[PDB]
Design a binder for this molecule. Structure first.
Ligand SMILES: *[C@@H]1O[C@H](CO)[C@@H](O[C@@H]2O[C@H](CO)[C@@H](O[C@@H]3O[C@H](CO[C@H]4O[C@H](CO[C@H]5O[C@H](CO)[C@@H](O)[C@H](O)[C@@H]5O[C@H]5O[C@H](CO)[C@@H](O)[C@H](O)[C@@H]5O)[C@@H](O)[C@H](O)[C@@H]4O)[C@@H](O)[C@H](O[C@H]4O[C@H](CO)[C@@H](O)[C@H](O)[C@@H]4O[C@H]4O[C@H](CO)[C@@H](O)[C@H](O)[C@@H]4O[C@H]4O[C@H](CO)[C@@H](O)[C@H](O)[C@@H]4O)[C@@H]3O)[C@H](O)[C@H]2NC(C)=O)[C@H](O)[C@H]1NC(C)=O
Ligand SMILES: *[C@@H]1O[C@H](CO)[C@@H](O[C@@H]2O[C@H](CO)[C@@H](O[C@@H]3O[C@H](CO[C@H]4O[C@H](CO[C@H]5O[C@H](CO)[C@@H](O)[C@H](O)[C@@H]5O[C@H]5O[C@H](CO)[C@@H](O)[C@H](O)[C@@H]5O)[C@@H](O)[C@H](O[C@H]5O[C@H](CO)[C@@H](O)[C@H](O)[C@@H]5O)[C@@H]4O)[C@@H](O)[C@H](O[C@H]4O[C@H](CO)[C@@H](O)[C@H](O)[C@@H]4O[C@H]4O[C@H](CO)[C@@H](O)[C@H](O)[C@@H]4O)[C@@H]3O)[C@H](O)[C@H]2NC(C)=O)[C@H](O)[C@H]1NC(C)=O
Ligand SMILES: *[C@@H]1O[C@H](CO)[C@@H](O[C@@H]2O[C@H](CO)[C@@H](O[C@@H]3O[C@H](CO[C@H]4O[C@H](CO)[C@@H](O)[C@H](O)[C@@H]4O)[C@@H](O)[C@H](O[C@H]4O[C@H](CO)[C@@H](O)[C@H](O)[C@@H]4O[C@H]4O[C@H](CO)[C@@H](O)[C@H](O)[C@@H]4O[C@H]4O[C@H](CO)[C@@H](O)[C@H](O)[C@@H]4O)[C@@H]3O)[C@H](O)[C@H]2NC(C)=O)[C@H](O)[C@H]1NC(C)=O
Ligand SMILES: *[C@@H]1O[C@H](CO)[C@@H](O[C@@H]2O[C@H](CO)[C@@H](O[C@@H]3O[C@H](CO)[C@@H](O)[C@H](O[C@H]4O[C@H](CO)[C@@H](O)[C@H](O)[C@@H]4O[C@H]4O[C@H](CO)[C@@H](O)[C@H](O)[C@@H]4O)[C@@H]3O)[C@H](O)[C@H]2NC(C)=O)[C@H](O)[C@H]1NC(C)=O
Ligand SMILES: *[C@@H]1O[C@H](CO)[C@@H](O[C@@H]2O[C@H](CO)[C@@H](O[C@@H]3O[C@H](CO)[C@@H](O)[C@H](O[C@H]4O[C@H](CO)[C@@H](O)[C@H](O)[C@@H]4O)[C@@H]3O)[C@H](O)[C@H]2NC(C)=O)[C@H](O)[C@H]1NC(C)=O
Ligand SMILES: *[C@@H]1O[C@H](CO)[C@@H](O[C@@H]2O[C@H](CO)[C@@H](O[C@@H]3O[C@H](CO)[C@@H](O)[C@H](O[C@H]4O[C@H](CO)[C@@H](O)[C@H](O)[C@@H]4O)[C@@H]3O)[C@H](O)[C@H]2NC(C)=O)[C@H](O)[C@H]1NC(C)=O
Ligand SMILES: *[C@@H]1O[C@H](CO)[C@@H](O[C@@H]2O[C@H](CO)[C@@H](O[C@@H]3O[C@H](CO[C@H]4O[C@H](CO)[C@@H](O)[C@H](O)[C@@H]4O)[C@@H](O)[C@H](O)[C@@H]3O)[C@H](O)[C@H]2NC(C)=O)[C@H](O)[C@H]1NC(C)=O
Ligand SMILES: *[C@@H]1O[C@H](CO)[C@@H](O[C@@H]2O[C@H](CO)[C@@H](O[C@@H]3O[C@H](CO)[C@@H](O)[C@H](O)[C@@H]3O)[C@H](O)[C@H]2NC(C)=O)[C@H](O)[C@H]1NC(C)=O
Ligand SMILES: *[C@@H]1O[C@H](CO)[C@@H](O[C@@H]2O[C@H](CO)[C@@H](O)[C@H](O)[C@H]2NC(C)=O)[C@H](O)[C@H]1NC(C)=O
Ligand SMILES: *[C@@H]1O[C@H](CO)[C@@H](O)[C@H](O)[C@H]1NC(C)=O
Ligand SMILES: *[C@@H]1O[C@H](CO)[C@@H](O)[C@H](O)[C@H]1NC(C)=O
Ligand SMILES: *[C@@H]1O[C@H](CO)[C@@H](O)[C@H](O)[C@H]1NC(C)=O
Ligand SMILES: *[C@@H]1O[C@H](CO)[C@@H](O)[C@H](O)[C@H]1NC(C)=O
Ligand SMILES: OC[C@H]1O[C@@H](O)[C@H](O)[C@@H](O)[C@@H]1O
Lengths: 835, 96, 95, 96, 93
C-alpha cells in the first residue's frame, strides 16, 4: 500500500578520475594527515547560531585550517551588509541567456568570496516547478529540465570560477512547502510529506538538471526536507548512493538542509557527508554526528573508509574551486549587523569583533541591471511599448510601483508585500543596499525629457486614479504576487501561495485605470504565473510586461525595457487560463491520517507545458513565448545525422575503498583539558573512553545487521553503474547524434533579440508531444541573417528504461521542431538514421 | 520654460540652518544614509491628489487653499537623497 | 618530412599558388609506390583527428562563416584565382 | 560652475538639419559606424595650442582673433560618437 | 607567509627561485609563482610544491634528467633579486 525506497549500498567512494583528479589528490593528502576527531569536524556543523555563518563546521587548528562557512543564498550573500541583491533565478531563466547566468554566478561568488564564505547555498534545481503555486519556485529556474539544467550549469560555473564552492539544492522532489518538516497548522503528523515518483519520471524530469549540475563540476549538493518514497531525502540511500553518487558519478559532498538530518549511522551509510547546522534540533546540544560519529567509527558501526570519504569529498570540493588560493577570513556575522558581539550567538558567549562591514559589491550593479532588463517578458503589445520619451503626462499607478514604508530591509527575510516586489521571502534572500523603484526611475526618465508625472501608490484611492488616468497620455499600472519559504506566513500564504491571483488589491486598480485610460501598460512583478483571464484582453490594455523579481536595480532595469533600449526575453513558464489547467494541486490537508502525507507524482513528466500540450489545453501565453520590438522568421531547417558510435553501457568495477590513516583509539578522542566547553556547542570529542556513556543514545548497542540494510559496510570493489561512469552519467550519453542548423532573419525595422528554441518529439505513445532540448539568445540588426547551429546528444533523444536501468533511443521516430516558443514552431524534420 | 532653475535656487537659498554641531554639510563619503519620516516621501494619492492640496500625506511643499497650484511633479527628499547617496557609492534606506 | 615526423602541410603548396605540393598528389603516389608505409600516413590522419575529437570539434562545430582574404559579403571561394562566387562573409559577432 | 549645461543645450539646439532622406536620426544600433574627416578630431597641438585659435588643425569649435577664449577641454565629434556607438555595442573607426 | 604591511589592498606576485648548485648552473632559476590579493595587515600562507624536474638538470651523457649532488637552495621573495628568505633542500630523513 505505502511507497517504498529500496536500499542501495555501499555508499560510493570518490574515485579520483577525470576533471576531479588534481582535487582528489590534494584532498587525500590533506585528510591523510588527520586524526579521527579532526575528520569528524569537517562533517558536523557546530550548532545553530554557534559561529558566524548560517552553517559552519569546526576548525582543524593543528593545521591552521579555519573550518568551512556555508552561507545563503542563491541570489546573493544573506544576512550581511554592503552586498548586492541580484535578480531571482526565475528572471535568469527568463533571459534564456547562459552567458548572463554565468556572469551573475561570477558576481555572486565574488561577494561570497570577499565575505570569507566557502560554500554558497545555491543554485536551485529543486523545486523544479511541479506546482505553479509552490512557494519557492522563484528561487529556482523553470519547470523544464533542459532550461533549468543549462542555467544550473552556467550558474555553478560562474560561482566556482569565482573561487566559491556551489551547492545544488534541494535534492530531491522538494516541490512544495506545506508539510516539508511535518506538523504545522495544528495537524499532528509524525513525519514530513513524502514525494513518490516513479523511476522514469525521476529520470526524465527532476534528476536531469542535477546531472547537468554535477556534470558542470558542482562541489556540493543539499538534500531536502521531504521524504522520497517514505525515506527522508537526507537518509535516502537510493537518491544519494544510487542516483547521485553511482549513476551521476558525483564526486563532491552532500549536506543536509537545516534540520533535514534524521539519523547518525543510517544517514552516514546512506550517503550523507555533512550535517547542517550540526545538531538534531536548533540548539539541542545533541548531534547525530559529532561525538556520535567519533563513537560510531570507534565501535565499528561505520567503517573508517566512509568517514574518510566524507572528509575527502568535502576537501575535494574545497580544492576543486581553489579555496586554498583565496585567503579571506570570515569578516561578517549572520545573526546581527553589530560591529561587536558574541561569537557564540546562540548562548550569548565569546564577545569579539564580528562584523568588519566589508564592501563586496564592486561593479556588480551592472550585471543586475542587465539581467533585470533582458529578463522582462513582453506578453502583449498593441503599440503601448516602447515609450517614446516625450509623453506629455505619465501616470504610474499601484502600490507595486513604490517602496516599502518600513525600509528596503524592513521585514525580516523579506516577509511582506508592502510595495514593489523584487525578491520573494525566506532563506533565499539577501539584504538590499537600496532598491530603485519603478516610481523613482520612471519619474526620473519622464522628467529628463520634460514630461509631467504623477505616482498613485494607494490601491484604495480609486477616484484619484480614475481622475489622473482620464488625463494621462500613458498609464503604467503595477501589480504583484508574492511567495516564499513556509516558516513565514504572509496574509494566509504559508510559503505556498493560497491562490494564483494578484496581491495588494491590484485587480481593481487594473480595472479602474483600464476603464479611464486607453493606453494602459501593465507591469507584473510575480514569483510565477498569475491568472489574468479577466483583464489581459481588455482593449485599453495596450501592453503587458512581466518583470519578475529583478533585485536592487528594479526600476533602472525596467526603464531600459520600457523605452526600447534593451529587448525582452521569453516566459520560462506557462500562463494558463485557470489553476486546474496546471494540475498537480498542493497538498494543504493531511491525506494519510496521522502519518506522513503522500504526494504521488501521478502526472509523471506531465507538468507545465508538457501537460498543456498533452491534454490540448490552450494557455493564454505558452512556455517559451515573448514578443519582440521587431519580427523574426525561421527558414532552411536541416537535421544532419551524425554517425555516432553505438551506445556503450558502462561496465567494470570501482577500486576497493581505502582508509587514509591508522585506526584511532578512544583514548585519543577525549575533550582536551585546555578547551572551555561552550554550552550547546557541537564537538567531535568523547566524555570518556566508555563509548556507550559518551554517546548517550537510548538505543545504543545493536549489531549492524539488526538496524542497517545488507552491504552497507561492504568496502570491496563495486559494479560501475551501466548508466554511470563519469560526472553526469555515462560519457557515451553525451555523444553527438545530430547537427541541427536553421536560418533566423530579422524581417523588421529595428534591431532585436530572438530566443530560438529546439524541441524534440521522442515519438512514443507515452512521451510528451515535444520537449525542449536546445535554445540560444541572439541579437540581429534589421535584415540580418543568422545560421543557428545546435548539436543534439544521445541523451537528448533517449528515454529512461526502468527494465534495463539505462537510457535507450526508442524505435519511434523523433521529430525536431524549431522556432521561438513551445507552440510557434513553423519548421520540423524527422531525425533520420545515419545513411 | 526654464522656471525649474529659479524654483530650485529659491528652495536652496530659503533653507535655514538653525543648528549645526558638525552634522552639515554631508561629506559625500557616508556609507549608509537613513531617511526617516513620512515628510520625506510622496503623497500616495498622487501629487495633485487632494483638492487644493487639502491634506498632509507626504512631504510638505505647499499649504492648502486658493494659494496653490498644480504640480507638474514633485521631487521628494527621499527620491533626491537616494540619488545623491547612490551616486557616491553609499547604501540607503528610506523609512516613511 | 613525412618520415621525419611532419603531419600537416600548410598552406599546402610548395610555394604560394605554385600548383604543386610536396604532398597532395605526391603523398598519394609515395604511399602507392611503397616509399612511405601506410602506417605513417594513417598516423598523420589519426593524430589530426585525435586533436579534433580531444577538444570536441564533433560537439562544437559550426560551418565556417567568414573569409580571411576580404571583408565583402560576396566573393570567390577560391580567392587566389578569382573563382567560385558565393556568400563568404556572414558577419557574425563573436565578441 | 555648471555652464557646461547651457553650452551643451545651445550646441545641440543650434544644429541645422539641411538635408535628410533617411540618414538622421541614428538608431543607436548600427553595427559599424565610420567617422571621416580631419574636422572630427583633435588639434594635435592641444586645445589651446594656437594663439587666439589661429589655426584649423582639427574640429572647429571657434574662429580666431579676440573673439575667443581658452577651452577647459574640447570633446571632439570623434570622441563622443565613439563613446555612444560603443555604449550600444557597435563597432567603429575614425579616419582623420 | 606573505603579509600586507601597508594601508591599502594590494596584489603581490610571490616568486620561488632555485639555485641548482653546480659551477655551470645559473645563480638562480624561477620555479614557482602566484598572484595573491591581500587586504591591509592580512597574512597568507603561500604553498608551492616542487617536482623532480624543477631540481634536475639535463644530462647529455645519460640522455636523461638528473638531480645533481650539489646543494639546491630555494629562494623566496617578489622579484629575481628581492629574495630575503632562502634555505637549502635537505634529503628526506
Ligand atoms: C489571493 O491571495 C492574495 C494574497 O493573500 C490576497 O491578496 C489580498 O487581496 C485583497 C482583496 O483585494 C486585498 O485587500 C483589498 O485592499 C483594497 C485596498 O486596500 C487599501 O485601501 C483601503 C481603502 O482605502 C480608501 O478608503 C478608506 C475608506 O474606506 C479610506 O480610509 C482611505 O483613506 C481610502 O480613501 C479613498 O476611498 C474613499 C472611498 O472609499 C474616498 O472617499 C477617498 O477620497 C479615497 O479615494 C483601506 O481601507 C485599506 O486598509 C488599504 O489601505 C481594498 O479596497 C479592498 O477592500 C474592499 O473589498 C474588501 C473585500 O475584499 C472589503 O472588506 C472592503 O470593505 C472593500 O469592499 C468594497 O470593495 C469591494 C470590491 O473591491 C466590494 O465588493 C465591496 O462591497 C465594497 O464596495 C464598496 O467600495 C468600493 C470601492 O472600495 C466601491 O467601488 C463600491 O461602490 C462600494 O462603495 C480589499 O481590502 C489585500 O490587500 C490583499 N492582501 C495582500 C497582503 O496582498 C487576495 O485576497 C486573494 N484573492 C482571492 C480572490 O481570495
Ligand atoms: C556505535 O555507536 C553508534 C553511535 O551512537 C550507535 O548508533 C546507534 O545505533 C542504534 C542501534 O544500536 C540506532 O538506533 C536504531 O536506529 C534505527 C534507524 O532509525 C532511523 O532510520 C529509520 C528508517 O531506517 C531505515 O532507513 C535507514 C536509512 O535511512 C536504514 O539504515 C534502516 O535500516 C532502515 O532501512 C529500511 O528502510 C529503508 C527505507 O527507509 C529501506 O531502504 C531499507 O531496505 C530498510 O527497509 C527512521 O524511521 C528513524 O526514525 C524513527 O525514529 C526516530 C527516533 O528514533 C523518530 O525521530 C522518527 O520520527 C521515526 O519514528 C531513524 O531516523 C531504528 O530503526 C531502530 O529502531 C528500532 O529498534 C529500537 C529499539 O532498540 C526501537 O525503539 C524502534 O521502535 C525500532 O524497532 C523496530 O525494529 C526492532 C529491531 O531492533 C524490532 O524489534 C521492532 O519490531 C521494530 O520494527 C533504532 O532506533 C541509532 O540510530 C544509532 N545512533 C546514531 C546516533 O547513529 C551504535 O549502536 C553503536 N554500535 C555498537 C556496536 O555499540
Ligand atoms: C519509488 O517507488 C517506485 C516504485 O517502486 C520506484 O520505481 C521503481 O524503481 C525500481 C528500481 O529501484 C525499478 O526496478 C526495476 O524493475 C524492472 C522491471 O520492472 C517492471 O515491472 C514493474 C512492477 O511489476 C513495472 O511497474 C515496471 O514499469 C516494469 O515493467 C527490472 O527489469 C529491474 O531489474 C534489474 O535492475 C535491478 C535493480 O534496479 C536488479 O536488482 C536486477 O538484477 C535487474 O538488473 C539486471 O537485469 C536487467 C534485465 O534487463 C539488465 O538489463 C540489468 O543490466 C541487470 O543485468 C545483470 O543480470 C543479468 C541476469 O539478470 C545478466 O545477464 C547481466 O549480464 C547482468 O549481470 C528492476 O527491478 C522499478 O521498475 C521502478 N518502477 C517504476 C514503476 O518505475 C522508484 O525508484 C522509487 N524511488 C525512490 C527514490 O526510492
Ligand atoms: C573542532 O572544532 C572546534 C570548533 O572550532 C575546535 O574548537 C576550538 O579549538 C580551539 C583550539 O584549541 C580553541 O581555541 C582556544 O580557545 C581557548 C579557550 O578559550 C584559548 O585559551 C586558546 O588560546 C591559547 O592558544 C592560542 C593558540 O592556540 C594562543 O595564541 C593563546 O595566547 C592561548 O595560549 C595560551 O594557552 C595555551 C593552551 O591553550 C598554551 O599552550 C600557551 O602557551 C598559552 O599559555 C585557544 O585560542 C577554541 O576555543 C575551540 N572552540 C570552542 C568553541 O571550544 C576544535 O579544536 C576542533 N577539533 C579538532 C580535533 O581539531
Ligand atoms: C547521539 O545521537 C542520539 C540520537 O540517535 C542522541 O539521542 C538523543 O539523546 C537524548 C539524551 O539521551 C534523548 O533524550 C531523551 O528525550 C526524551 C524526550 O521526551 C526524555 O524523556 C529523556 O529525558 C530523560 O533523560 C535526560 C538525560 O540527559 C534527563 O536530562 C531528563 O531529565 C530525563 O530524565 C531524554 O532526554 C533523545 O530522545 C535522543 N534522541 C533520539 C532521536 O534517539 C544523543 O543525544 C546523541 N549524542 C550526542 C553526544 O549528541
Ligand atoms: C611533387 O614534388 C616535387 C618536389 O619534390 C615537385 O617538383 C617540382 O616540380 C616542378 C615542375 O612541376 C619543378 O619546377 C621546374 O623547375 C625548373 C628549374 O630547374 C624549371 O625549368 C621548370 O620550368 C619553369 O620555367 C619554364 C620556362 O619556359 C616554364 O615554361 C615552366 O612552366 C616553369 O615555370 C619548372 O618550374 C620543381 O623544380 C620541382 N621542385 C623540386 C623542389 O624538386 C612536383 O611538382 C610535385 N608534384 C605535384 C603533382 O605537385
Ligand atoms: C509592512 O509589512 C508588514 C508585514 O506584512 C505589515 O504588517 C502586517 O499587517 C497585516 C495587516 O495589518 C497584519 O495582518 C493582520 O493580522 C491579524 C492578527 O495577526 C496576529 O498574529 C500574528 C502571528 O501569526 C502576529 O504576527 C501579529 O502581530 C498578530 O498578533 C489579523 O487578525 C488581521 O485580520 C490581519 O490579517 C499582520 O499581522 C502584520 N504583520 C507583522 C509581521 O507585523 C504592515 O502592515 C506593512 N506596512 C505597510 C505600511 O504596508
Ligand atoms: C597646426 O596649425 C598651425 C598654424 O596654422 C600649423 O602651422 C602652420 O603650418 C603652415 C603649413 O605648413 C605654415 O605655412 C608656411 O608659411 C611659410 C611663410 O611664413 C611658408 O614659407 C611655408 O612654406 C609654409 O607655407 C604656417 O607658417 C604654420 N604656422 C605657424 C604659426 O607655425 C601646423 O602645421 C598645424 N599642425 C598640425 C600638426 O596639424
Ligand atoms: C477605454 O478607454 C477610453 C478612454 O480613453 C474609455 O472612454 C471613456 O469612457 C467613459 C465611460 O464610458 C466615457 O464617459 C468617456 O466619455 C470616455 N472618454 C473618452 C475620452 O472618450 C473607454 O470607455 C474604455 N473602454 C473600456 C471598455 O473600458
Ligand atoms: C471602479 O470600477 C468598478 C467596477 O470594476 C466600479 O463599480 C467602481 O465604481 C469604479 N470606481 C471608480 C472610482 O471609478
Ligand atoms: C558529559 O558529561 C557531563 C558531566 O561531565 C554530563 O552533564 C553530560 O550529560 C555528558 N554528555 C553526554 C553526551 O553524555
Ligand atoms: C551483497 O552484495 C553482494 C554482491 O557484491 C551480493 O552477493 C549479496 O547478495 C549482497 N548481500 C545481500 C544480503 O543482499
Ligand atoms: C526641458 O526644459 C528646459 C527648459 O526649457 C530645456 O532647456 C530642455 O532643453 C528641455 N528638454 C527637452 C528634451 O525638451
Ligand atoms: O539557511 C540554509 C537553508 O535553510 C533552509 O531552511 C532552506 O530550505 C535551504 O534552502 C537553505 O539553503
Amino acid at each position: 500500500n505505502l511507497a517504498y525506497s529500496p536500499p542501495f549500498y555501499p555508499s560510493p567512494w570518490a574515485n579520483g578520475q577525470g576533471d576531479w583528479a588534481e582535487a582528489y589528490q590534494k584532498a587525500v593528502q590533506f585528510v591523510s594527515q588527520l586524526t579521527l576527531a579532526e575528520k569528524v569536524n569537517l562533517t558536523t556543523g557546530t550548532g545553530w547560531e554557534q559561529d558566524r555563518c548560517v552553517g559552519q563546521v569546526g576548525s582543524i587548528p593543528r593545521l591552521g585550517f579555519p573550518g568551512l562557512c556555508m552561507q545563503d543564498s542563491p541570489l546573493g550573500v544573506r544576512d550581511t551588509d554592503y552586498n548586492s541583491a541580484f535578480p531571482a533565478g526565475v528572471n535568469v531563466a527568463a533571459t534564456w541567456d547562459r552567458n548572463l547566468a554565468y556572469r551573475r554566478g561570477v558576481a555572486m561568488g565574488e561577494e561570497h568570496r570577499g565575505k570569507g564564505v566557502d560554500v554558497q547555498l545555491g543554485p536551485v534545481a529543486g523545486p523544479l516547478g511541479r506546482s505553479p503555486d509552490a512557494g519557492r519556485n522563484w528561487e529556482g529556474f523553470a519547470p523544464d529540465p533542459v532550461l533549468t539544467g543549462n542555467m544550473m550549469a552556467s550558474t555553478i560555473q560562474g560561482i566556482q570560477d569565482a573561487g566559491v564552492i556551489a551547492c545544488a539544492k534541494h535534492f530531491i522532489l522538494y516541490e512544495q512547502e506545506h508539510f516539508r518538516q511535518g506538523a504545522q497548522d495544528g495537524y499532528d503528523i509524525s513525519d514530513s510529506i513524502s514525494a513518490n515518483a516513479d523511476d522514469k519520471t525521476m529520470h526524465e524530469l527532476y534528476l536531469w538538471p542535477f546531472a547537468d549540475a554535477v556534470r558542470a563540476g558542482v562541489g556540493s549538493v543539499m538534500c531536502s526536507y521531504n521524504q522520497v518514497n517514505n525515506s527522508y531525502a537526507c537518509s535516502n540511500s537510493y537518491t544519494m548512493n544510487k542516483l547521485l553518487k553511482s549513476e551521476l558519478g558525483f564526486q563532491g559532498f552532500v549536506m543536509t538542509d537545516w534540520g533535514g538530518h534524521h539519523s547518525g549511522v543510517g544517514s552516514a551509510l546512506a550517503g550523507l557527508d555533512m550535517s547542517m547546522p550540526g545538531d538534531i534540533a536548533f540548539d539541542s546540544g545533541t548531534s547525530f554526528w559529532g561525538t556520535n560519529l567519533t563513537v560510531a567509527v570507534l565501535n565499528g558501526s561505520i567503517p573508517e573508509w566512509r568517514v574518510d570519504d566524507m572528509a575527502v569529498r568535502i576537501m575535494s570540493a574545497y580544492y576543486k574551486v581553489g579555496r586554498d588560493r583565496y585567503s579571506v577570513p570570515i569578516n561578517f556575522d549572520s545573526w546581527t549587523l553589530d560591529t561587536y558581539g558574541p561569537e557564540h550567538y546562540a548562548v550569548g558567549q565569546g564577545q569579539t569583533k564580528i562584523n568588519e562591514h566589508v564592501d563586496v559589491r564592486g561593479n556588480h550593479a551592472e550585471i543586475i541591471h542587465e539581467i533585470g532588463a533582458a529578463s522582462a517578458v513582453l506578453l502583449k503589445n498593441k503599440g503601448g511599448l516602447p515609450l517614446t520619451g516625450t509623453e506629455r503626462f505619465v501616470g504610474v499607478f499601484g502600490k507595486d510601483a513604490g517602496s516599502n514604508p518600513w525600509g528596503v530591509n524592513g521585514c525580516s527575510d523579506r516577509g511582506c508585500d508592502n510595495g514593489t516586489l523584487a525578491m520573494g521571502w525566506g532563506s533565499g534572500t539577501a539584504n538590499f543596499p537600496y532598491l530603485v523603484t519603478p516610481e523613482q526611475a520612471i519619474q526620473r526618465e519622464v522628467l529628463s525629457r520634460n514630461g509631467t508625472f504623477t505616482g498613485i501608490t494607494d490601491n484604495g484611492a480609486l477616484a484619484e486614479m480614475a481622475a489622473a488616468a482620464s488625463q494621462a497620455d500613458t498609464c503604467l499600472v503595477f501589480a504583484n504576487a508574492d511567495s516564499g519559504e513556509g516558516y513565514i506566513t504572509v496574509d494566509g500564504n504559508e510559503g505556498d501561495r493560497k491562490n494564483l491571483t494578484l496581491w495588494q488589491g491590484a485587480d481593481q486598480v487594473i480595472h479602474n485605470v483600464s476603464a479611464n485610460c486607453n493606453n494602459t501598460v501593465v507591469v507584473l512583478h510575480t514569483v510565477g504565473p498569475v491568472l489574468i483571464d479577466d483583464w489581459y484582453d481588455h482593449p485599453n490594455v495596450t501592453a503587458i510586461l512581466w518583470a519578475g523579481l529583478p533585485g536592487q536595480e528594479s526600476g533602472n532595469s525596467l526603464v531600459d525595457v520600457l523605452y526600447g533600449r534593451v529587448n525582452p526575453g521569453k516566459t520560462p513558464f506557462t500562463w494558463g487560463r485557470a489553476r486546474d489547467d496546471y494540475g498537480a494541486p498542493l497538498i494543504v490537508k493531511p491525506n494519510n491520517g496521522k502519518g506522513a502525507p503522500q504526494q504521488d507524482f501521478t502526472e509523471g513528466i506531465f507538468i507545465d507545458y508538457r501537460r498543456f500540450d498533452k491534454y490540448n489545453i490552450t494557455p493564454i501565453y505558452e512556455f517559451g513565448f515573448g514578443l519582440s520590438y521587431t519580427t523574426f522568421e525561421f527558414s532552411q531547417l536541416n537535421v544532419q545525422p551524425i554517425n555516432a558510435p553505438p551506445y556503450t553501457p558502462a561496465s567494470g568495477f570501482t577500486k576497493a575503498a581505502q582508509s587514509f590513516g591508522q585506526p584511532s583509539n578512544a583514548s585519543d578522542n577525549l575533550y582536551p583539558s585546555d578547551i572551555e566547553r561552550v554550552p550547546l556547542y557541537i564537538y567531535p570529542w568523547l566524555n570518556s573512553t566508555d563509548l556507550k556513556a559518551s554517546a548517550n543514545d537510548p538505543d545504543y548497542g545493536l549489531p549492524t545487521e539488526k538496524y542497517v540494510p545488507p552491504n552497507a559496510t561492504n568496502g570491496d570493489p563495486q559494479p560501475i553503474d551501466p548508466a554511470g561512469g563519469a560526472p553526469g552519467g555515462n560519457p557515451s550519453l553525451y555523444e553527438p547524434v545530430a547537427r541541427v542548423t536553421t536560418i533566423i532573419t530579422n524581417t523588421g525595422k529595428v534591431t532585436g533579440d530572438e530566443v530560438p528554441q529546439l524541441y524534440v518529439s521522442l515519438g512514443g505513445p507515452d512521451d510528451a508531444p515535444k520537449v525542449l532540448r536546445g535554445f540560444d539568445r541572439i541579437t540581429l540588426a534589421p535584415g540580418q541573417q543568422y545560421l543557428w547551429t545546435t548539436t543534439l546528444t544521445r541523451r537528448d533523444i533517449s528515454n529512461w528504461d526502468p527494465v534495463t536501468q539505462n537510457w535507450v533511443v526508442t524505435n519511434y521516430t523523433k521529430t525536431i521542431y524549431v522556432g521561438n516558443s513551445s507552440r510557434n514552431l513553423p519548421l520540423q524534420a524527422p531525425l533520420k538514421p545515419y545513411p
